[PDB]
Design a protein around this ligand. Structure first.
Ligand code: 289
Ligand code: 289
Ligand code: 289
Ligand code: 289
Ligand code: 289
Ligand code: 289
Ligand code: 289
Ligand code: 289
Ligand code: 289
Ligand code: 289
Ligand code: 289
Ligand code: 289
Ligand code: 289
Ligand code: 289
Ligand code: 289
Ligand code: 289
Ligand code: 289
Ligand code: 289
Ligand code: 289
Ligand code: 289
Ligand code: 289
Ligand code: 289
Ligand code: 289
Ligand code: 289
Ligand code: 289
Ligand code: 289
Ligand code: 289
Ligand code: 289
Ligand code: 289
Ligand code: 289
Ligand code: 289
Ligand code: 289
Ligand code: 289
Ligand code: 289
Ligand code: 289
Length: 274
């Protein structure tokens, strides 16, 4: 029955709460301070603008397409909820809780996406000054960490099929895990105690394995470098002609496949195992 348009809600607006149920619709809503939009099962919000002290709740079976989050606003994608092509600007936060799903999120300068407690995000775009945080059962797939962008894979966080482009950075902490990371030219992946598997490092890209960190099954293509620091470990690295594995004193590598023209640099004698 219900279906709203160009409604502004919150503070000293006409209405404070907006609720959506099965079949309801909301378009170009503007959520301002004290404003709450609740998108419930079978509800659909579209083009919602979320400003300081405004919140959009996406509950189970709810859907929110093209929400745009600004300075001090919040999108909560709860269990069973779905958010598509969300845009997060300076000071905006999208949080994906247990059972929630975000697809195609664009995170802009100073914007934050938190994927926690078993939420999932696919195809996040992490641009310059943007940040993505993944933790405690949260899983992110096909994140593009673009120039200026940063992804934090924290304890219990998991990232798959991440792509790192020019000055894009991925930080994998203790208890964090990354799989099938692609490091393009200018990309940096840092294992600050965390684990990586199935990394590919193309020309200009770098993986840095620090204390407690561990890389498995890494391919270093021409111009790529895996850099292993003290008490970092790597295994099953293949170094292609023109690529490099550099191991600092006290770092370790094993099951190294060194192709002809692949550089290996060691600073201790028992550093690398072929
Ligand atoms: C919208 O859906 C229901 C409403 O009566 C119309 O279908 C409620 O159950 C919900 O709480 C929400 O208000
Ligand atoms: C944003 O401002 C709102 C508005 O001024 C009405 O009091 C508050 O309700 C919010 O809590 C927030 O401070
Ligand atoms: C949207 O409807 C929900 C629905 O009744 C699911 O039980 C409510 O839980 C929300 O609070 C909102 O009214
Ligand atoms: C939310 O309501 C939905 C609605 O009837 C159709 O979109 C159901 O699909 C869900 O099962 C839930 O009750
Ligand atoms: C409500 O609308 C959503 C969206 O705004 C459509 O572009 C759909 O994704 C849902 O299926 C529902 O129809
Ligand atoms: C909902 O409305 C949005 C609005 O024009 C924002 O200014 C569009 O950007 C979306 O494409 C959608 O149609
Ligand atoms: C959306 O509805 C949710 C409800 O439990 C689904 O059954 C709430 O948990 C959210 O806070 C919001 O009201
Ligand atoms: C909302 O959460 C789930 C969602 O519909 C997933 O399709 C289901 O457990 C229920 O429909 C619930 O109302
Ligand atoms: C709410 O609509 C979503 C739609 O794709 C958003 O545009 C669906 O994916 C959800 O399953 C739900 O129907
Ligand atoms: C919802 O709007 C989005 C728009 O960019 C938000 O400003 C589109 O990207 C979506 O495809 C949809 O039209
Ligand atoms: C909007 O205000 C936000 C915050 O409320 C300031 O304390 C800033 O973080 C944003 O940068 C923007 O100015
Ligand atoms: C979505 O639902 C969540 C729900 O209570 C989890 O069980 C809330 O944490 C969010 O605030 C939002 O309402
Ligand atoms: C949270 O949301 C749903 C819950 O049982 C009812 O809102 C489940 O479908 C999800 O798997 C998650 O547990
Ligand atoms: C939002 O969540 C959908 C999930 O099935 C709940 O409706 C997925 O199809 C998507 O992750 C969409 O982005
Ligand atoms: C997030 O918590 C959900 C919720 O607490 C209900 O059990 C679970 O369904 C999920 O499995 C996840 O752990
Ligand atoms: C949001 O999370 C979804 C998860 O299955 C729970 O709905 C994924 O399927 C989507 O790809 C998105 O990450
Ligand atoms: C990216 O630009 C942001 C700006 O506010 C967007 O309008 C800053 O908040 C960031 O610090 C960064 O410079
Ligand atoms: C979701 O789940 C956890 C919750 O605090 C307790 O189960 C944490 O991992 C996150 O902080 C988030 O609240
Ligand atoms: C998530 O969507 C992405 C989309 O094109 C936005 O950049 C794809 O590239 C991913 O493969 C995934 O489908
Ligand atoms: C991307 O550009 C950001 C700037 O805020 C854009 O407005 C910088 O903060 C980053 O260092 C990067 O150059
Ligand atoms: C990852 O960080 C999460 C984030 O700070 C909000 O929950 C926590 O949930 C985890 O405990 C972990 O540190
Ligand atoms: C958040 O909880 C993670 C999850 O429960 C299991 O991977 C915990 O192991 C961590 O303590 C993290 O802080
Ligand atoms: C990565 O490219 C960025 C791009 O021009 C803006 O997104 C620069 O800001 C960075 O300095 C880097 O060159
Ligand atoms: C994972 O945790 C790390 C930890 O606090 C110390 O190694 C940080 O370095 C990372 O930035 C991320 O928070
Ligand atoms: C993350 O924590 C690890 C700690 O031993 C937890 O097991 C360290 O080995 C890492 O160096 C990092 O501080
Ligand atoms: C860290 O654990 C990840 C996690 O189980 C996600 O499913 C794996 O994908 C990684 O390969 C790594 O072992
Ligand atoms: C690889 O190319 C990068 C380019 O800007 C983006 O592909 C350079 O920044 C690197 O230095 C390297 O030459
Ligand atoms: C990342 O490190 C993991 C380590 O044992 C800590 O969990 C391995 O399981 C992975 O294969 C990779 O070495
Ligand atoms: C990996 O991280 C190290 C970190 O400080 C562990 O304490 C750096 O010293 C290394 O240079 C590398 O970035
Ligand atoms: C390298 O540094 C790690 C620690 O996190 C630095 O504070 C340790 O876990 C290692 O055992 C080693 O000291
Ligand atoms: C291997 O090829 C690299 C890459 O494919 C693009 O230039 C070169 O950078 C190296 O010099 C090497 O010849
Ligand atoms: C191994 O092959 C490299 C080739 O360019 C791979 O693209 C050369 O650069 C090396 O000198 C060696 O011949
Ligand atoms: C590489 O470092 C490893 C790490 O420090 C764990 O103790 C050692 O196990 C290896 O012997 C090598 O020194
Ligand atoms: C080892 O073999 C390399 C060969 O071309 C790989 O196909 C040479 O480039 C090296 O110089 C060396 O002969
Ligand atoms: C590696 O070789 C060293 C040797 O004396 C010189 O190559 C030893 O110092 C190491 O313990 C290890 O045998």
């Amino acid at each position: 029955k219900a279906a709203y348009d160009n409604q502004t809600i919150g503070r000293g607006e006409t209405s404070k709460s907006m609720h959506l149920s099965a079949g309801d619709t909301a378009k170009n809503t503007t959520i301002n301070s004290g404003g709450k939009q609740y998108v419930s099962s079978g509800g659909s919000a579209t083009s919602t603008t979320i400003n300081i002290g405004g919140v959009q709740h996406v509950s189970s079976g709810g859907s929110a397409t093209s929400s745009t989050i600004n300075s001090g606003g919040h999108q909560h994608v709860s269990s069973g909820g779905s958010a598509t092509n969300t845009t997060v600007n300076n000071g905006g936060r999208q949080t994906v809780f247990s059972g929630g799903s975000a697809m195609g999120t664009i995170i802009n300068s100073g914007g934050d996406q938190y994927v926690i407690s078993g939420g999932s995000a696919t195809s996040a775009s992490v641009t310059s000054g943007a940040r993505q945080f993944v933790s405690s059962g949260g899983i992110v797939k096909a994140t593009s960490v673009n120039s200026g962008g940063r992804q934090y894979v924290r304890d219990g966080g998991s990232a798959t099929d991440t792509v790192l482009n020019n000055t894009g950075r991925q930080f994998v902490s203790s208890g964090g895990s990354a799989a099938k990371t692609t490091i393009n030219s200018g990309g940096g992946m840092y294992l600050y105690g965390g684990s990586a598997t199935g990394t590919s490092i193309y020309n200009g890209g770098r993986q840095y394995v620090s204390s407690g960190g561990s890389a498995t099954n890494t391919t270093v293509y021409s111009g790529g470098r895996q850099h292993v620091y003290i008490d970092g470990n790597v295994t099953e690295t293949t170094i292609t002609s023109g690529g490099m594995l550099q191991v600092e004193a006290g770092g370790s590598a094993s099951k190294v496949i060194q192709n002809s023209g692949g550089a290996v640099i060691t600073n201790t004698s028992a550093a690398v195992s072929g």
